[PDB]
Curated annotation (Swiss-Prot):
GO terms for biological process: innate immune response; negative regulation of inflammatory response; negative regulation of T cell activation; regulation of apoptotic process; T cell activation. The gene is TNFAIP8L2. Coiled coil: none annotated. The keyword Phosphoprotein applies. Keywords: Cytoplasm, Immunity, Innate immunity, Lysosome, Nucleus, Phosphoprotein, Ubl conjugation. This is Tumor necrosis factor alpha-induced protein 8-like protein 2. It comes from Homo sapiens (Human).
């Protein structure tokens, strides 16, 4: 696994664990995240996607970059964090991914996608993340996101 991606994944785990107060819950969401990513990766490697699905994958990446850039913008003291906006963007990502894998992955895998995106798009979690107690976590996530965008890994 890519080192920067691992660093961000680590931070997402830590944010989830601290927000929920549950190691088992955080481990579960990150396990599902990893499973989903790899399953989608395999579909890309095996040439399983049709033309409309490949266009959907392109849209998903655009949306994911938009989410990342918006997360970064809200990190600026200048601009006011709006949880509903970031949550809405993450839900747009969820929905594009769900469409992408509708005909390729099992309903169980669709459930894992909903679990991951619904966990992190939770306005409660995001509000905590952008609040006074999560300053260090947010900085590290933003550093990672900026590096991923810079290196073309999103
Ligand atoms: Cl298709």
């Amino acid at each position: 696994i890519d080192e920067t991606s691992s660093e961000v994944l680590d931070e997402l785990y830590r944010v989830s664990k601290e927000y929920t107060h549950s190691r088992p819950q955080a481990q579960r969401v990150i396990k599902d995240l990893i499973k989903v990513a790899i399953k989608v990766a395999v579909l890309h490697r095996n040439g399983s996607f049709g033309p409309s699905e490949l266009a959907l994958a392109t849209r998903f990446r655009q949306k994911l970059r938009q989410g990342a850039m918006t997360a970064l913008s809200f990190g600026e003291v200048d601009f006011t964090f709006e949880a509903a906006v970031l949550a809405g963007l993450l839900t747009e990502c969820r929905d594009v991914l769900l469409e992408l894998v509708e005909h390729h992955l099992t309903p169980k895998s669709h459930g894992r996608i909903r679990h991951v995106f619904d966990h992190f798009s939770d306005p409660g979690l995001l509000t905590a993340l952008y609040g006074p107690d999560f300053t260090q976590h947010l900085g590290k996530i933003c550093d990672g996101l900026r590096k991923l965008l810079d290196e073309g890994k999103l």
